[PDB]
Amino acid sequence: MVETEPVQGCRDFPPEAMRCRRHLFDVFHATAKTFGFEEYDAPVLESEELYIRKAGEEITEQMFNFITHRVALRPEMTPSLARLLLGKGRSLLLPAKWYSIPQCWRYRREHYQWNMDIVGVKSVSAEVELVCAACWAMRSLGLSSKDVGIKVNSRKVLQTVVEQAGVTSDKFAPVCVIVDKMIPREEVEAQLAVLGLEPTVVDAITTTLSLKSIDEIAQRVGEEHEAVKELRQFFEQVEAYGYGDWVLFDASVVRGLAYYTGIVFEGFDREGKFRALCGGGRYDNLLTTYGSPTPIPCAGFGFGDCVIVELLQEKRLLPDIPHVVDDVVIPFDESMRPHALAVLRRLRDAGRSADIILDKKKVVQAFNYADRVGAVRAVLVAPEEWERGEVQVKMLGFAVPLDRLV
Amino acid sequence: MVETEPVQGCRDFPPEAMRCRRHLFDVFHATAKTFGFEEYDAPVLESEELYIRKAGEEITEQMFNFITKGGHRVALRPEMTPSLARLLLGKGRSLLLPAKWYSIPQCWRYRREHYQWNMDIVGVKSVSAEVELVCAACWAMRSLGLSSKDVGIKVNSRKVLQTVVEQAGVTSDKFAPVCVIVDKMIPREEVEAQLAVLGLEPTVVDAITTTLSLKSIDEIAQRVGEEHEAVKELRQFFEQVEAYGYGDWVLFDASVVRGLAYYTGIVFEGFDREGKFRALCGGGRYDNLLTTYGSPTPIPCAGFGFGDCVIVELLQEKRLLPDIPHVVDDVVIPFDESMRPHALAVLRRLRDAGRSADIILDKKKVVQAFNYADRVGAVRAVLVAPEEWERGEVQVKMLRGFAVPLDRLV
Numbered sequence: 163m164v165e166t167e168p169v170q171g172c173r174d175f176p177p178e179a180m181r182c183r184r185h186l187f188d189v190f191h192a193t194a195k196t197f198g199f200e201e202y203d204a205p206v207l208e209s210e211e212l213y214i215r216k217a218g219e220e221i222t223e224q225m226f227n228f229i230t231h232r233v234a235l236r237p238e239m240t241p242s243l244a245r246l247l248l249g250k251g252r253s254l255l256l257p258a259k260w261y262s263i264p265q266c267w268r269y270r271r272e273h274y275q276w277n278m279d280i281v282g283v284k285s286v287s288a289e290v291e292l293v294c295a296a297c298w299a300m301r302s303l304g305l306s307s308k309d310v311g312i313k314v315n316s317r318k319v320l321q322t323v324v325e326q327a328g329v330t331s332d333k334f335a336p337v338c339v340i341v342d343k344m345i346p347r348e349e350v351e352a353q354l355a356v357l358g359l360e361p362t363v364v365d366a367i368t369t370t371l372s373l374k375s376i377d378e379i380a381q382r383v384g385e386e387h388e389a390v391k392e393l394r395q396f397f398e399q400v401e402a403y404g405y406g407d408w409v410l411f412d413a414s415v416v417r418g419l420a421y422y423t424g425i426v427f428e429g430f431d432r433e434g435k436f437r438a439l440c441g442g443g444r445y446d447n448l449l450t451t452y453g454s455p456t457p458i459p460c461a462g463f464g465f466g467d468c469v470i471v472e473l474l475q476e477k478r479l480l481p482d483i484p485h486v487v488d489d490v491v492i493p494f495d496e497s498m499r500p501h502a503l504a505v506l507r508r509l510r511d512a513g514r515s516a517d518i519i520l521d522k523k524k525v526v527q528a529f530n531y532a533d534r535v536g537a538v539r540a541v542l543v544a545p546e547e548w549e550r551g552e553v554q555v556k557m558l559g560f561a562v563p564l565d566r567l568v
Numbered sequence: 569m570v571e572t573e574p575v576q577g578c579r580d581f582p583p584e585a586m587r588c589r590r591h592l593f594d595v596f597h598a599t600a601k602t603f604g605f606e607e608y609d610a611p612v613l614e615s616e617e618l619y620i621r622k623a624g625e626e627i628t629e630q631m632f633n634f635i636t637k638g639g640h641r642v643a644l645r646p647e648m649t650p651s652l653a654r655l656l657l658g659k660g661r662s663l664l665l666p667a668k669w670y671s672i673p674q675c676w677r678y679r680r681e682h683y684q685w686n687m688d689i690v691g692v693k694s695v696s697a698e699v700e701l702v703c704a705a706c707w708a709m710r711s712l713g714l715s716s717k718d719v720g721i722k723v724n725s726r727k728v729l730q731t732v733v734e735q736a737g738v739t740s741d742k743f744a745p746v747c748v749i750v751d752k753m754i755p756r757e758e759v760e761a762q763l764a765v766l767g768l769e770p771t772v773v774d775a776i777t778t779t780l781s782l783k784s785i786d787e788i789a790q791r792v793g794e795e796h797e798a799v800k801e802l803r804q805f806f807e808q809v810e811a812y813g814y815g816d817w818v819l820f821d822a823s824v825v826r827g828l829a830y831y832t833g834i835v836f837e838g839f840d841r842e843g844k845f846r847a848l849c850g851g852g853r854y855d856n857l858l859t860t861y862g863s864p865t866p867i868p869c870a871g872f873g874f875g876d877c878v879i880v881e882l883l884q885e886k887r888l889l890p891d892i893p894h895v896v897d898d899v900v901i902p903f904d905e906s907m908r909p910h911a912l913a914v915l916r917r918l919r920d921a922g923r924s925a926d927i928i929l930d931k932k933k934v935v936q937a938f939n940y941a942d943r944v945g946a947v948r949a950v951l952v953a954p955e956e957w958e959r960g961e962v963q964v965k966m967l968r969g970f971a972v973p974l975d976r977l978v
């Protein structure tokens with residue numbers, strides 16, 4: 163016997179499991195369409211060059227890479243997106259809103275991640291729309307603002323604090339990667355020291371993450387500080403769109419990725435049971451680091467397929483969806499198969515989903531099968547009715563003319 | 569600059585290219601739904617064990633395989649059927665049969681990458697399986713705008729060649745390699761030479777050659793008899809496709825065997841009627857595969873694969889792939905930034921009603937917002953101006969410009 167289990171850390175999706183994944187992906191697609199995003203894709207195999215950011219990101223540390231040329235199964239999509247945008251150059255109409263549902267990889271070693279990104283929008287209206295899109299998808303899955311929310315912050319506050327301590331800007335990214343981890347405080351404090359931060363700088367960093375309102379941020383760095391102005395705009399806009407109950411400020415949110423420059427956010431369950439449901443932020447330098455002659459504003463998020471499903475299971479929002487089909491055509495016997503095929507054809511021409519019983523079996527077993535596959539309707543093709551130009555129809559029984567079947 | 573081009577042999581799908589791929593995949597999904605097939609998936613990374621059939625198949629020769637840090641032999645799948653077999657084998661007697669499963673996996677080779685619609689029927693002994701599969705393939709092609717004048721499906725049974733090979737005293741273990749070789753018929757001299765190395769005397773090769781060049785089912789009947797399984801089965805097959813209404817799409821070709829070791833009965837492949845392209849799709853019955861994998865009971869199977877590259881080229885030639893421009897129902901335009909919060913309330917209402925709507929995100933003049941709306945293929949522009957708003961209205965323009973109440977917008 164071969165190994166029936168999949169490769170370590172990877173999932174199978176037989177029809178039952180696939181119906182669940184499809185229910186999720188439908189929402190992702192429908193939400194992207196509702197928001198005017200365009201689908202894109204790129205290869206799961208990318209060059210390893212793409213992912214060498216040197217900030218000690220967990221995402222790059224756990225990279226599923228190998229030698230053919232140094233390549234890797236993508237751990238995230240954003241770098242692939244950047245490559246595509248960079249390739250298009252001035253030919254790309256901006257603003258652009260691009261989305262995808264890539265499988266992404268790590269050495270669970272795989273997950274699907276809905277990505278949504280807005281390109282060419284300087285203003286926080288980008289982050290507003292992205293955050294509303296994430297909420298929209300969660301609400302579409304049956305979740306409420308009682309079940310989940312999105313925590314929101316700007317990295318610019320911490321930037322100012324780090325810069326005011328005389329820290330080289332090249333340490334800012336690593337700092338964020340470290341502060342994201344806050345493991346015990348003592349552990350995070352120790353890691354900052356290794357980067358080269360004296361205890362006074364660490365204290366200032368700590369204090370600002372524990373500030374509980376935007377007003378308190380304003381008191382520390384000023385009301386005219388970009389972060390304050392931008393965050394206020396952000397909440398004003400989400401309030402106006404009608405999702406004010408879904409969003410809130412949290413000064414501890416920074417995310418683990420090196421490239422976020424401004425607003426950052428993450429979805430969470432209100433019971434404190436699960437890891438982050440989605441995460442993202444503004445990354446206005448990324449394309450400059452890739453060699454764009456002109457800076458290109460960007461913001462986006464990723465929304466994994468594993469945590470959301472667990473949450474939905476806990477909330478009883480993932481009932482088993484049984485397979486369905488409109489009609490099952492049953493030949494009374496093999497002499498009726500050619501006539502049943504003509505009927506089957508007509509049913510499918512009218513846009514119905516139809517089976518015909520393929521192997522040899524008795525009518526009552528054909529009916530059982532029809533129930534098993536969730537047929538709405540059983541269409542028996544018997545010699546008696548056929549001579550009258552009819553078939554027997556049974557809902558899940560009466561004679562019907564062929565033209566009247568559809 | 570980083571390298572903007574993708575890894576060697578792999579494709580990018582920016583929105584324009586992705587719309588084309590989506591148009592194709594929609595047809596695959598719709599056809600599968602129309603035929604009552606259920607979607608499935610499995611990992612693109614499988615164990616290399618799965619693909620070691622030892623018949624010299626082109627598919628296994630060109631395998632994109634590698635060793636993990638932990639020393640396990642894995643490969644990016646070159647086809648889906650082995651993954652399917654694994655899933656079925658894993659389910660055991662818990663699987664209701666018959667089962668009709670489909671997927672659109674990306675598959676890989678060392679172009680190194682393509683998408684391949686797979687459709688398979690499990691648990692059906694009779695040729696009704698192959699009938700349905702073939703009709704499904706035709707159905708997808710017709711849905712894409714192709715006719716029976718543009719394409720067809722060549723059909724054969726491997727059982728004819730089986731009988732001929734067995735009657736020459738050939739060990740059954742050579743039958744699979746023979747099919748793999750005969751599939752290649754490169755020059756005849758080249759294929760003749762390869763059969764000799766497997767260990768076939770020229771008389772056996774001659775018999776093989778002759779049967780592939782037989783041009784009708786009657787001629788096959790003359791050679792192996794009218795009551796031979798192959799003849800009976802092929803006749804049933806054409807009778808059934810004729811009855812379903814796709815008789816013009818299908819025909820017999822004794823040279824079709826396919827390159828895969830595991831096909832045991834009927835085999836088939838789609839082709840363009842102008843002789844310009846490689847095979848559009850291919851498949852057949854493979855009744856032993858699950859037994860080779862260790863199933864305690866034999867499990868009838870048949871299926872096909874339908875790649876995404878050749879079909880698209882054909883559709884381009886036939887002018888059936890016009891550029892589909894992106895569309896969206898509404899573009900909401902704030903007259904200025906003071907109107908953004910009101911435009912957001914409007915945007916919200918539009919999306920609540922199931923419409924696809926943008927709001928202009930950055931700061932720009934109305935006329936530029938209108939241009940943008942045209943660029944993204946907006947059916948409708950919804951201007952939110954301070955004047956109309958005090959009346960409980962907005963300006964709507966179709967793509968002139970009339971005032972409308974908010975509740976009437978949807």
Ligand SMILES: CC(=O)Nc1cnc2ccccc2c1
Pocket residue numbers: 237238266267268270271272273466468469
């Ligand atoms: C719990 C889980 O499987 N999620 C997950 C989260 N991040 C990943 C990142 C890369 C590859 C696989 C990943 C999988």
Ligand SMILES: CC(=O)Nc1cnc2ccccc2c1
Pocket residue numbers: 646675676677679680681682875877878
């Ligand atoms: C035109 C094309 O790329 N066809 C093709 C056909 N078979 C394949 C099999 C595996 C990977 C890529 C493949 C690509």
Ligand SMILES: N[C@@H](Cc1c[nH]c[nH+]1)C(=O)O
Pocket residue numbers: 238239240277278279419441442443461462463464
């Ligand atoms: N790539 C990020 C999410 C994201 C997409 N776009 C911007 N951010 C992640 O994997 O967490």
Ligand SMILES: N[C@@H](Cc1c[nH]c[nH+]1)C(=O)O
Pocket residue numbers: 647648649686687688828850851852870871872873
């Ligand atoms: N795996 C086959 C197609 C197929 C699927 N099922 C049966 N046949 C191929 O790649 O040619």
